[PDB]
């Protein structure tokens, strides 16, 4: 049989790159690749997303997004145009957690974890400074509620809830009278998770107040790190970073692999039908569509550039690498990882905010 | 709080350098960070790197594996071990320090020693 | 890392305002503001301009700053040139991973 797979790249090195790894793939039945353009609105793309599909009626398809704005707007018309068809769907560089909700998008996975996913690294870094009390401070979105409903469930096990939660609009000017209110509860480690162009504002707020001096402790995710928001930021934040979030070469070999050893797999079975090979003519279903998922969930491969690659049930990567990083006179520099297990400090010494080296207590 | 610069001075090639600042009037354990930025003669300007006081130094990564810096409080002084000197390094070097606050700002500066 | 372009060979008669761009090469100044520090001919350089609005204490009115955001670089405005304003001219600025300093410019 002779089966390929389609994609939706950005450029067309990363083009050449997929050619490469798939010519690679096929030396070690079959398979060939088809790829497509990005186009700036979205009713286009998903109409030659399924004119691509109908084209060669693809198993799967590798989409991507790319570094453009409005955030959620390139990889939405091809994940709906799959939950029509019904036929899997592989992203890579998609790193919101609306997707993850398996009631709207039931064929969707991720070779990077979500931004609601950093919620277990300060866990582990509460657990091993010894701090006990948290003030979180989020937007009113859908990232902060399933932020902060992650964080209760992971914290609700030693039953010490967080001190107190602080909601805020997103989009405003002034946002004093939460700070001033926050100012003063009994504690000094803060968690912050916002949009950067949110969280600039609270940056200049809190300088202000004189809320950034000695004993206060600060932590963020990865969007209050990169962009604008080093405009205004107080030296010894600590933030989270991920080690190959940007080099897609990794990623697109990974993904390869992993849907050529699926599809190889797959076959062995019996009672298969291919999908559909029409946008326009057929207005069915591809209903040996789920057991392709299913198989897919478990298909723990063996090793590879980034590590050992698996799933959960809930279209997301598992054993991610992180890199904690503090904020040292306007330059960042590495100073921990996390694989999973307990974070392993380098050998540096952290400058905890307002100056002066020694780990602050945060109780008073 | 008043700076000059210090050092042995020497030109010959091939060998190692080593100079050490003044500062007088301030104190080393602060909240500031001190560079050693260096001049080549007819041309630009080019930072070194800085050192906090207690504990960690940042670089450039050009000659990030070539060059030191080191403080010491008791004397109340930092200086520079610069390694591997070729004879296409030779520049007067200044000291300077830079007030933290939320961004750089090298001053005051040094009255500079020639190399 | 990147560079720095500024413009060479300025100069005119006393009493009038020039303007001394400082161009950024690759990238955006939007993250990071830039500073302008003047040298005396045998003297150690001085900071002039510093947030290119705010002036250090004791520093002259008459030099200004402002910035474009469209073609990526920073004005520096001096007003009312006199005998003393024949000096090197230079802008610093500074990113997520180190500190470079620019070419630099001499006004006559």
């Known amino acids: 049989k002779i089966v390929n797979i389609g994609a939706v790249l950005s450029t067309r090195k990363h083009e050449q790159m997929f050619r490469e790894a798939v010519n690679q793939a096929n030396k070690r039945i079959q398979l060939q690749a088809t790829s497509v353009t990005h186009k700036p609105n979205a009713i286009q793309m998903a109409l030659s997303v399924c004119e691509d599909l109908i084209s060669s009626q693809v198993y799967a398809i590798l989409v991507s997004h790319p570094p453009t704005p409005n955030d959620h707007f390139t990889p939405t018309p091809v994940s709906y145009t799959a939950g029509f068809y019904r036929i899997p769907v592989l992203g890579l560089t998609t790193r919101m957690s609306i997707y993850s909700d398996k009631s709207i998008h039931l064929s969707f996975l991720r070779t990077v974890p979500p931004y609601s996913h950093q919620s277990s690294v300060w866990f582990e870094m509460m657990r091993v400074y010894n701090w006990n009390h948290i003030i979180l401070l989020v937007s009113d979105d859908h990232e902060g509620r399933a932020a902060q409903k992650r964080l209760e469930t992971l914290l609700e096990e030693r039953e010490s809830k967080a001190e107190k939660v602080l909601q805020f609009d997103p989009g405003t000017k002034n946002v004093t009278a939460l700070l001033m209110e926050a100012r003063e509860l009994e504690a000094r480690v803060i968690i912050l998770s916002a949009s950067e162009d949110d969280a600039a504002t609270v940056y200049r707020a809190a300088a202000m107040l004189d809320m950034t001096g000695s004993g206060y402790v600060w932590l963020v995710g990865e969007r209050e790190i990169s962009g604008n928001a080093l405009r205004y930021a107080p030296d010894g934040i600590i933030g989270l970073q991920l080690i190959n979030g940007k080099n897609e070469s990794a990623h697109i070999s990974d993904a390869v692999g992993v849907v050529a050893q699926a599809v190889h797999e797959l076959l062995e079975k019996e009672n298969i039908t291919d999908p559909p090979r029409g946008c326009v003519g057929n207005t069915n279903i591809w209903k040996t569509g789920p057991l392709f998922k299913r198989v897919l969930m478990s298909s723990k491969y063996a090793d590879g550039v980034t590590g050992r690659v698996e799933f959960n049930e809930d279209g997301d990567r598992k054993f991610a690498q992180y890199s904690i990083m503090n904020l040292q006179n306007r330059k960042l520099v590495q100073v921990g990882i996390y694989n999973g297990t307990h974070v392993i400090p380098n050998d540096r010494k952290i400058i905890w905010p307002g100056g002066e080296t020694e780990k602050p207590r945060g109780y008073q | 709080l008043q700076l000059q610069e210090s050092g042995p001075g020497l030109v010959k090639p091939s060998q190692t350098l080593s100079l050490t600042c003044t500062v007088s009037?301030?104190?080393?354990?602060?909240?500031?960070?001190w560079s050693w930025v260096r001049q080549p003669p007819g041309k630009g300007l080019e930072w070194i790197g800085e050192?906090?006081?207690?504990?960690?130094?940042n670089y450039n990564p050009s000659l990030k594996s070539r060059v030191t810096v080191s403080v010491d409080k008791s004397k109340n002084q930092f200086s520079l071990k610069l390694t591997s000197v070729t004879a296409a390094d030779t520049a007067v070097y200044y000291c300077a320090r830079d007030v933290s606050g939320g961004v750089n700002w090298f001053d005051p500066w040094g009255q500079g020693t020639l190399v | 890392n990147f560079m720095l372009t500024q413009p060479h060979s300025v100069s005119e008669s006393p009493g009038k305002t020039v303007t001394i761009s400082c161009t950024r090469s690759?990238?955006?100044?939007?993250?990071?503001?830039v500073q302008w520090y003047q040298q005396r001919p045998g003297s150690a350089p001085t900071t002039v301009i510093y947030?290119?609005?705010?002036?250090p204490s004791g520093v002259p009115d008459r030099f200004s700053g402002s910035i474009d955001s469209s073609s990526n670089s920073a004005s520096l405005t001096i007003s009312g040139l006199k005998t003393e304003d024949e000096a090197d001219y230079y802008c610093?600025?500074?990113?997520?991973?180190?500190?470079?300093f620019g070419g630099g410019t001499k006004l006559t």
């Open positions: 690759s990238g955006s100044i939007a993250s990071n503001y």
């Open positions: 610093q600025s500074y990113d997520s991973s180190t500190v470079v």
């Open positions: 947030e290119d609005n705010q002036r």
């Open positions: 050192i906090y006081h207690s504990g960690n130094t």
């Open positions: 009037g301030g104190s080393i354990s602060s909240s500031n960070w």
